[PDB]
Amino acid sequence: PIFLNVLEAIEPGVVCAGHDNNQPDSFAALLSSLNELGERQLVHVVKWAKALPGFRNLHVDDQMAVIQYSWMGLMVFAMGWRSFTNVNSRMLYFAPDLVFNEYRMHKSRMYSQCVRMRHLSQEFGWLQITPQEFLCMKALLLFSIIPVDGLKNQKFFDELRMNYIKELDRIIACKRTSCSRRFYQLTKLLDSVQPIARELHQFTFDLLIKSHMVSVDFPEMMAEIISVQVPKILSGKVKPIYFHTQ
């Protein structure tokens, strides 16, 4: 299984937020630790993406673009998996040093968004998602959001996305109507990530705009992305690719 061998080999290790778990929880400190973790994760998502099979087939500009547009969804999806494996989805395992209990969901003022993320985490349990299905789904998620008017070289992208869908189907058939109900389940789960990412895009965008006054810090790399790429998505210029009607 050359494909799966590669996916495990390139999977990022643990990433820490650097949070002070000794301080009392507060809005500014929690959101500032999440933003720092987001910057750290982004660095890892780029190295991970660039090591994926066939990634260099994409035009150089298209490579960074798909990474910037899918960053949020990719973070949420992997965070949902970590929460599942580490705490059976009972809390949101953003990092070993930044685990959100219900009190933190509330103090971060991201309660409703955390509910949606924890629900996603529970679905890894309900559907009995295997670590290999998770790896394949997460790679495909990178190729699931594009400009309405297309990429610099859309044909290379369409071929790469087609191959990752086929690999997902393959890992399925290896042990299998059954396959079909399974492919249906996994594609529905992939789609469900998009609305969650859209809520988080709205939330981080609104926070960036008022960040001067709510004392929340945004590292340079993302503030760039949040003010330049995220608005393209929120204004409908860049849209997710759904398997099913929405």
Which CB, 80 or 171, lies closer to ligand 17H?
80
Residue 207 contacts ligand 17H per CB under 6 A: yes
Task: Determine whether the annotation assigns residue 85 to a binding site.
Answer: no
**Token pair for 55:** 């990634």
Stretch touching ligand 17H by CB under 6 A, among 57-65, 128-136, 160-168, 196-204: 196-204
* DSSP 8-state code for residue 153: T
| Separation CA 118–CA 128 (nearest Å) | 16
Residue 141 contacts ligand 17H per CB under 6 A: no
| Separation CA 29–CA 174 (nearest Å) | 46
Residues 154-173 that bind ligand 17H (CB under 6 A): none
Instruction: Provide the minimum distance between the beta carbon of 49 and ligand 17H in the complex, in angstroms, as a whole number.
Output: 16
Q: Given candidates 7, 19, 31, 104, which one binds ligand 17H under the rule CB under 6 A?
A: 31
Which residues, in sequence order, are CB contacts of 14 under 8 Å at separation 6+?
95, 96
Helix segments in the chain, DSSP class H:
2-10, 27-50, 60-87, 102-107, 111-126, 131-142, 154-173, 178-210, 220-228, 230-234
Known binding residues for 17beta-hydroxy-5alpha-androstan-3-one: 35, 82, 204
Site residues, ligand 17H (CB under 6 A): 31, 34-35, 37-38, 41, 75-76, 79, 94, 200, 203-204, 207, 222
